[PDB]
Amino acid sequence: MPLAFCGTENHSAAYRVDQGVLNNGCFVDALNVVPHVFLLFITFPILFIGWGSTWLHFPGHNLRWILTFILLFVLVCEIAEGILSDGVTESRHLHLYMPAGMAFMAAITSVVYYHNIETSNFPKLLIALLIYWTLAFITKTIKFVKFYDHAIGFSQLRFCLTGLLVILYGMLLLVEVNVIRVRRYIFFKTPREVKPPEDLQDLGVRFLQPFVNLLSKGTYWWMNAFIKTAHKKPIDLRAIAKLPIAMRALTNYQRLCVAFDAQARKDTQSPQGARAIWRALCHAFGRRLILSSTFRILADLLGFAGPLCIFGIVDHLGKENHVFQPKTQFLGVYFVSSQEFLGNAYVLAVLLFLALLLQRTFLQASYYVAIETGINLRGAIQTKIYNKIMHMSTSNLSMGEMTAGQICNLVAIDTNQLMWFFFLCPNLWTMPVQIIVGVILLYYILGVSALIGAAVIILLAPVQYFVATKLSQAQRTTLEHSNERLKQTNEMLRGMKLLKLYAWESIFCSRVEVTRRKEMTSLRAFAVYTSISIFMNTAIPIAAVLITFVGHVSFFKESDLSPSVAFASLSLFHILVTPLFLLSSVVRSTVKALVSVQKLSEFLSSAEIRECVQIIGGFFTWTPDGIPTLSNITIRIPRGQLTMIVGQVGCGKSSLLLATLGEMQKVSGAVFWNSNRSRGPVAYASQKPWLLNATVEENITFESPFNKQRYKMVIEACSLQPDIDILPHGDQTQIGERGINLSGGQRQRISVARALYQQTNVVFLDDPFSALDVHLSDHLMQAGILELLRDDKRTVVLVTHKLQYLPHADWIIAMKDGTIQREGTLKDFQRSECQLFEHWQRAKIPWRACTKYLSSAGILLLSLLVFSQLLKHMVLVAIDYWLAKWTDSALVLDQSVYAMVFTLLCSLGIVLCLVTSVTVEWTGLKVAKRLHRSLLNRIILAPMRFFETTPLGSILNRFSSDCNTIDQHIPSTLECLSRSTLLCVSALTVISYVTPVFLVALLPLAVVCYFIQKYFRVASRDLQQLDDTTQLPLVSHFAETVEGLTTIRAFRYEARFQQKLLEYTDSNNIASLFLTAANRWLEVCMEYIGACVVLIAAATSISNSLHRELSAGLVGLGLTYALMVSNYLNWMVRNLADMEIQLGAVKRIHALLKTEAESYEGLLAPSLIPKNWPDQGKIQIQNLSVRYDSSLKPVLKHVNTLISPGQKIGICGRTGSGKSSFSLAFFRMVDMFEGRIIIDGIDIAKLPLHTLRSRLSIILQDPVLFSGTIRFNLDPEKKCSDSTLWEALEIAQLKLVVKALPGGLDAIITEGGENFSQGQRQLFCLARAFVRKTSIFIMDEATASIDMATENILQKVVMTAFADRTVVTIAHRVHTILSADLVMVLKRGAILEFDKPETLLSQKDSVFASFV
Ligand SMILES: Nc1ncnc2c1ncn2[C@@H]1O[C@H](COP(=O)(O)OP(=O)(O)OP(=O)(O)O)[C@@H](O)[C@H]1O
């Protein structure tokens, strides 16, 4: 019985060349052997030379690749037929499965060869490949025609398979000659030559997926070298790719505008938009969305080709493996019948493997195509929105502010949810087909009990739909309650010094905590209504299986257990269960999408703007019909001029200025225009100022080149170099909104500086000296503006009421009654009775997450949580093994015992799922509660120096957003991770128990999964942060656009901001595309790992059940867990990345709870120190030397100075050195590192800081009123009496507002007293000074106030001296601080001057020098 090469039967009678040379059936296989080893032996040196820049794919190569893939498929099928035929006979018959194997290796090498000949564009070297292709085409044609001459027919399998790969070689020979025809290299005198694409020619595009071969489009191979690059260096934005041509937002915008033009030509409906959006979106994006849907439909169909293989495997493995032989026997060769082919065991396993390996690639490809179309939708639709921002009128809208906030939220939420609709759009095409084919083949598998189970799953989607609706309602109510909570947090982070100064931390912490616990009750209801979603989500399959098997056994009594049917039914149940919960969310996303398209359509058909200086006819309005708001305007202003304008208060100044800008709907009239009919870049600066959220030099230069001379002149004229030094960066500080909070004169001067700077042939100033109330600054600015515009020789127009210069030396223009009266000389206004006014890197977080779970849960519930999760997964393992054992023991024939224990295990499963769903929400609720109370308590017990050190933005961000993350993001991610990784460990444990060879094949596979997980985590964290920090400047740009719109359209500088918008949108979309494609590459890699798990498990299970005779119920339970392992890895990796990103805002929350200082410590005997404390006023400071960080510069040194009782020593000094330091340390609010600080003769070094800040009143520089009730705005901690509050709020100031208030002492302080006064704040300060029996009152100077307000403050200080008589005031306004008793001038941080009489202060040198 030796090693025969062809066959040893009949004593080598197949080695007989008689009866023709070609009619020997083994000789034809030798002929088919020939071309493959010919290609191997001519293409091995080529490939080895190759293995020892620029890419261009050959024309028509995608169908080349797909024909190669399907010929690999049919060659694997012929390998299977060859194995079953050479395996049935007694001999070896090696001529049945050697030629197919060498053909498989030849096809693999000829596609590697095609890739290595696609890398180097040298087409004359695939002539050999074409000479390969005709030879095999000839040879298998011979084989097919010999089957036809031997009359096999379509009955046997190998005839059909042979004809199939004949037409394979024919079609790829036709592809080869199509390439020959196109590129014209071999026999043509002139070869066609193509160039690499411009996206390749950029070299600044790494994301080369739209221009790469089809295998890398399928498996994302180019991502690998990217993701492995990301482990050495992190992924910067410069490391990211450019926005290539097919994905450039301008190009997609052009395509979308072509769609708009095509739709608007065919329909042209003016009050439409919705149908217009429908036709435009469909015509513009169907060419990719339908392709994504097609791949998704094919992936769904090949997904449902999974349980059929389980059914065939378990049905043949249950039927004893009796036959194992083909019927047909032609010429001593056994031909496999196709039923016996598709009835084999190993063959069906390999077919299952290749079907899963194509299903679970087309699903991810469909995902990716949907994502790419969604990102191009986001790009083009945001670009269209910005284009209709670039023409939108403001006064044709009433609420132009509320609508610009609306349109920014519109852009963000609307465009994002339109993007999310085009993410989820193939689901509404496939999930119905998924469910329908699932119901159909589940009825084919099992029966009417499967229809009962399908009624369970079809009655588990409306429950999720209704639960998500109630959840969204609860989330709305929770967020609109937590908005008030966040407003309370903003009111608690703006006033740290004022609340610690007025001893108002405890009452405001309680007023925050009451709203927080109300929001916590609302969040508890939210957690219940989102726990019930998880409970229904995790108990619908258990009830489905229970009702299914209970129907088939108890209710049907039709057939046996049918384990092939059972495990196919279970796998069908999982494959049907997965889309079902997703579809309710899809329908919700569709509803949100329709609302979003309605919103953006009602936006898109809003009013546009419009289609030397001279205006003749004069009618101009805002409303597009009726009432011209500025008419009779006949004014001419040629170049070389400086027209001052004038008028009454609100007499049409900004209306005339905007009418000169061309931003008003001019009904009657003409606009002559001539630049030294098209419009020029008129410079403008509105009444309301505006600054881009950028640097101050960036808000000054305004996208223009930078010279030192004009910038120095603008910093000098507007007094900006002291303003630059007032900021810690100057020309680098983030000016305006989202940055350094400026002042109105400073912002007006910066806007005027950019207007003056912008080098224009005209300059419009719509009252710049209106808000800059610094008169000497305004006069120096006016003179420098006159000098600059005279030395620049450019036309100017200043429309204001500053009549100090307007009748003197201008070519003025006067607007009377909202119309132009006279634009001439000053003598005409001295002749129209108008001169009377003119003569007047970390990996993970494991410590912080452990600290969170430890300090949050408590082991009596953390143990219960882990135990309930483990018990639920053990119960699911138990129900699976009980189903397997019951289906096995019913086929081999206590059946009611099996059904009863199956029902009582499904009930325990449902109960444990309810328990885990309760436990997750309860753990998250207690976590958020105790973490919030810890953060609030640690934020109360803080010094004001920490609030000086760290900003409120960082504290508020890691407060609010991390509270949101630990309130609405951490419990769901924890539930998903704790179900996904535990289901994964359960399934792989079950696979290893059923197949004990699996763990041996698991360990290298798990190592590969761990390394892929590590590199994906490293890349995905950085791409997530790059997504967030790229989508932030885009809405920042939409804010700065909608805010200063008329300035941009005034400058005619729209195209540069259009390009800045397009650059911002491209930089956001490319990061979104990298995050999408990294997610999809992760899912593809883990899905091939799962397919190899399926292959090894199925192979070893069928091998040990053919021979070792396994309890084949366990084999089907193995395959249906290898499939659910296969998607448990997906959720495991995704939930691990989400838990990493969500736990990063809690590592920071714990880190900001780890900053505690300013401990209240009364170390004396507190029984007598704050009762004696009121009304003495005797705080004798004895050499108390101060420091703050105790680093480089103490201020107070050995200052042994006393304030006498009654002697209200207003002691002002140098405000840089000795004013504020003593005023801060007087209230024990600084580090007096030595000395002795007495307080009315008591020890202020051991006082209760609650009691110390209670019985020592103060005044402020920028005073503020804490929002609340009027009794809570006056004295919340005291609440003494109403008549005392009337006496305070009467005798200080504001009596005619307090008695005229709607509430009285019980009225709402409207968020700081937003329109009360600024002296009403000082009146409340005097109220708190008069109410708390406070003799002392530590005062600082007013920053900005009126002289009469300062005189009223002096009169109130006289009344405070008449009622309290103790005061210590420091004032950089030294000229009003002179009415005192004693004074101290503390220059350059020392105790330099002290004058206990006031006349010695006016007598001595330095104090009088401080008085001048
Ligand atoms: N962009 C706009 N949005 C809304 N209303 C506008 C707009 N432009 C002009 N109007 C209307 O024009 C009318 C005139 O306002 P007005 O002309 O007094 O500006 P102004 O005289 O420059 O104000 P001020 O005297 O404070 O500088 C007002 O009713 C105003 O609402």
Curated annotation (Swiss-Prot):
Q: Which residues lie on this side of the membrane: Extracellular?
A: 1-30, 80-96, 144-159, 310-346, 445-450, 548-566, 996, 1100-1115
Chain sites annotated for binding ATP: W622, G650, S654, S655, S1317
> In which residues is ADP bound?
T1215, G1216, G1218, K1219, S1220, S1221
Q: Where is the ABC transmembrane type-1 domain?
A: 289-592, 862-1141
Q: Which residues are glycosylated?
A: N10
Segments spanning the bilayer are 31-47, 63-79, 97-113, 127-143, 160-176, 294-309, 347-362, 429-444, 451-463, 532-547, 567-582, 863-880, 902-918, 978-995, 997-1009, 1084-1099, 1116-1131
Topological domain (Cytoplasmic) residues are 48-62, 114-126, 177-293, 363-428, 464-531, 583-862, 919-977, 1010-1083, 1132-1412
Name the Gene Ontology molecular function terms of this record.
ABC-type transporter activity; ATP binding; ATP hydrolysis activity; metal ion binding; potassium channel activity; sulfonylurea receptor activity
Disulphide bond pairs:
C6-C26
Which InterPro entries does the entry mention? AAA+_ATPase, ABC1_TM_dom, ABC1_TM_sf, ABC_transporter-like_ATP-bd, ABC_transporter-like_CS, ABC_transporter_C-like, ABCC8, ABCC8/9
The way this protein sits in the membrane is described as:
Multi-pass membrane protein
Q: Which domain of life is it from?
A: Eukaryota
- Mind telling me which Gene3D superfamilies this protein's record contains? ABC transporter type 1, transmembrane domain (1.20.1560.10), P-loop containing nucleotide triphosphate hydrolases (3.40.50.300)
Activation/inhibition comment:
KATP channels are regulated by cytoplasmic ATP/ADP ratios; ATP inhibits the channel by closing the pore, while ADP activates the channel. Activated by phosphatidylinositol 4,5-biphosphate (PtdIns(4,5)P2).
Concerning its family, UniProt says: Belongs to the ABC transporter superfamily. ABCC family. Conjugate transporter (TC 3.A.1.208) subfamily.
Q: Main role?
A: Regulator subunit of pancreatic ATP-sensitive potassium channel (KATP), playing a major role in the regulation of insulin release. In pancreatic cells, it forms KATP channels with KCNJ11; KCNJ11 forms the channel pore while ABCC8 is required for activation and regulation.
> How does this chain assemble?
Forms an heterooctamer with KCNJ11; four ABCC8/SUR1 molecules interact with one KCNJ11 homotetramer.
Q: What is this protein called?
A: ATP-binding cassette sub-family C member 8
What species was this sequence derived from? Cricetus cricetus
Q: What broad taxonomic lineage does this protein's source fall under?
A: Eukaryota, Metazoa, Chordata, Craniata, Vertebrata
Gene name of the encoded protein: ABCC8
